[PDB]
């Protein structure tokens with residue numbers, strides 16, 4: 199377990215004095231490592247006992263343990279991704295950690311699914327003429343990925359990561375239609391504007407985001423996907439995998455809702471690639 | 480196990496007479512289901528014993544078993560995705576099947592990693608000034624997804640799914656630089672053109688695709704990602720998840736190769752979002 203991630207996760211447990219230590223530590227770990235307890239206490243503006251209580255609340259044995267573990271937690275890639283990367287990891291180590299973390303997160307998401315929320319989303323999309331996917335950064339990529347899966351299911355599918363296009367498109371939706379807003383944070387300002395416009399048009403807003411976020415509150419159907427990845431700190435990685443697997447379940451659901459006609463539709467779609475891909479052998 | 484998928488998978492095992500049956504069955508399952516053995520034999524242009532041998536080679540007990548199982552394998556969504564969907568599945572059923580299939584595939588990919596191929600790809604990218612991601616359809620979405628992960632790692636990252644842009648961009652690459660071609664099939668014609676241009680420019684071609692494909696043969700570093708998903712038939716789904724997790728391992732590898740400077744780089748990148756996302760609480 200990477201001590202900096204642990205400290206970041208732990209902040210809502212600390213007392214105010216200890217929190218001040220936590221934030222000083224997160225802001226500059228490498229100074230702390232060459233710091234006496236007195237210097238650090240001076241730095242943060244707290245007593246030496248506060249330092250030690252912080253260390254113990256973090257699960258270290260005391261100040262020397264803090265520094266030791268800090269020294270093991272400063273890999274550059276530990277900041278890149280929420281994986282327990284250690285200063286000296288090899289492809290051997292980080293490859294398996296990344297896959298294992300992904301497996302563990304998807305299992306957790308699978309376990310926590312709101313099956314009913316899924317059923318309502320699938321039935322909304324299945325009755326829609328248009329489905330749109332809205333998001334930014336990582337969630338924009340998910341949006342366009344989802345458009346590529348959904349365009350073949352006998353409706354109009356579109357994805358936008360330009361908020362001006364989202365707004366203008368949204369307000370043209372019939373109440374009969376669906377928009378999915380995708381957000382690991384649930385806190386993207388433009389996306390809440392867009393979500394409000396969807397609502398105002400009377401269309402179904404599906405939120406693919408954690409529960410009890412600003413965006414979740416606006417939703418018609420809150421999918422409640424609670425991957426624990428702190429994207430104020432880490433690159434979004436695990437969160438978008440979970441989002442895409444959820445997208446795939448909605449798509450499957452919509453396919454389910456179509457007739458035996460779909461089979462031949464999908465066969466035409468695949469046939470159209472014949473001249474663009476070499477034959478197998 | 481969905482009988483139509485099983486039959487499709489099984490084709491390379493059959494004898495020529497049985498194969499003719501397989502393809503007739505795949506092409507129109509619903510006719511077969513209301514067909515006598517004699518009619519089907521007439522249809523395909525084979526003997527009744529051939530029909531029965533086909534059934535047995537497919538692991539059915541005989542012709543009546545074939546029809547029964549066919550009747551259970553005709554869900555519209557069974558054609559949409561390579562998941563063992565049955566005529567009457569509920570979100571309960573297909574949601575868990577989709578997650579389970581994904582977990583099983585990622586475990587298989589994790590087990591089969593070519594760790595050395597990973598190390599060589601990571602070191603190529605880590606010395607490059609430019610990294611480019613090329614693909615189409617699902618693989619285009621992966622390309623743009625990867626660009627969103629990589630732009631923060633102190634190089635120029637670009638993704639193109641327009642083959643004309645790929646060609647023109649490729650030929651401007653220094654031998655020092657990297658292109659990743661992404662393909663579940665390994666058989667996209669434009670992508671082989673692009674891959675050849677990368678080679679011709681002396682730049683490192685990483686192929687994120689199955690081994691022993693046309694594209695794998697062109698590679699400088701073949702990542703050998705052998706997800707078993709037949710995208711001549713099914714929507715690409717599981718394949719692109721595996722691709723993205725592999726992308727994330729390469730990104731982690733590159734982060735690893737940077738100094739402690741990266742920490743503050745990545746912190747600036749995250750700080751720039753402050754005015755665009757509400758604060759937590």
Ligand SMILES: O=C(O)C(=O)C[C@H](O)[C@H](O)COP(=O)(O)O
Pocket residue numbers: 333334335336337380381382383384385386389429432433434627749752
């Ligand atoms: O690239 C990064 O480091 C990011 O964190 C950018 C985020 O993907 C976007 O700001 C979208 O944020 P969400 O609306 O919470 O999905």
Ligand SMILES: O=C(O)C(=O)C[C@H](O)[C@H](O)COP(=O)(O)O
Pocket residue numbers: 346468471614615616617618661662663664665666667670710713714715
């Ligand atoms: O949407 C579908 O049904 C497709 O199969 C389209 C494929 O994603 C592209 O043709 C790219 O193919 P690859 O180069 O093998 O990755």
